[PDB]
Amino acid sequence: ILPDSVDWREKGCVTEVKYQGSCGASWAFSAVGALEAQLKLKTGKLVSLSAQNLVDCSTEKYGNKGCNGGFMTTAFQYIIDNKGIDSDASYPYKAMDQKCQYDSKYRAATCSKYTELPYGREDVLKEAVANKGPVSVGVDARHPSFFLYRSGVYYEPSCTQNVNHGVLVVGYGDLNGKEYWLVKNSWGHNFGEEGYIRMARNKGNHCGIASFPSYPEILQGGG
Ligand SMILES: COc1ccc(C#Cc2cc(-c3nn(CCCN4CCOCC4)c4c3CN(S(C)(=O)=O)CC4)ccc2Cl)cc1CNCc1ccccc1
């Protein structure tokens, strides 16, 4: 069965909120955030992974442009191709494009595969968040109400299903009935509720939250 509510922070699978600054690298944070949860699920260690590693190294082969945007799916493919990603501690974030400085000596996680979920299916997103872990998603976050969000369940009538900002679904629930997705942003802890925003759930793929979801996996052998 599916829990009525999920918050992956309760199980210690979510690192501290990061602050991307003036580097359009939300895709990098969304991808590492999803992989961090799998690293903890599979090994028990919660380590921040290096978004800067993706910004510098997951580039033109993966359709990504560093501080000018990119994609969580191909970020995961780089980690598969590279056979690792560095910890954030060892490859820290500078909010600018750099030369690739990946060092395998400090590799903290790998990725075996990733799964893309079907467009707009909030039921399938719910099941993945419940049974797999946090899911990387894009949202339409260009509207002023997103930038000003403080609390409650976010609903914006002008939102569309075209995504323009990468975030991390770490759970779901309802606020006094009002169904929401628990969303980790990368605008530091002063955005929203200590860096989190609850976004309207089951209201016709609101703000595109279920448009392009994906999550990575770390496989233990096989049968
Ligand atoms: C103009 O600025 C933009 C515009 C777009 C984005 C973005 C994005 C984004 C996009 C996707 C996304 N995957 N796929 C499927 C795969 C596409 N790929 C093809 C080639 O490579 C591999 C994957 C699509 C979209 C977008 N769609 S669509 C228009 O929605 O139909 C078309 C199909 C998945 C995750 C993210 Cl995150 C980011 C910025 C910069 N951020 C600005 C900003 C906005 C608000 C608040 C703060 C900052």
CATH code of the domain in which 131 resides: 3.90.70.10
CA of 138 to the centre of ligand 1 (A): 7
Nearest alpha carbon, ligand 1 atom 1: 164
Q: Whose CA is nearest to atom 29 of ligand 1?
A: 162
Domain span holding position 186: 1-223
Instruction: Name the residue with the closest Cα to ligand 1, atom 8.
Output: 164
Number of domains in the chain: 1
- State the structure-solving technique: X-ray
Q: Which residue has the tokens 């895709």?
A: 27
Measured in angstroms, the resolution is 2.2
Pocket of ligand 1 (CB under 6 A): 24, 27, 63, 69, 71-74, 138, 141-142, 162-166, 211-212
Q: How far away, in angstroms, is 2 Cα from ligand 1 center?
A: 30
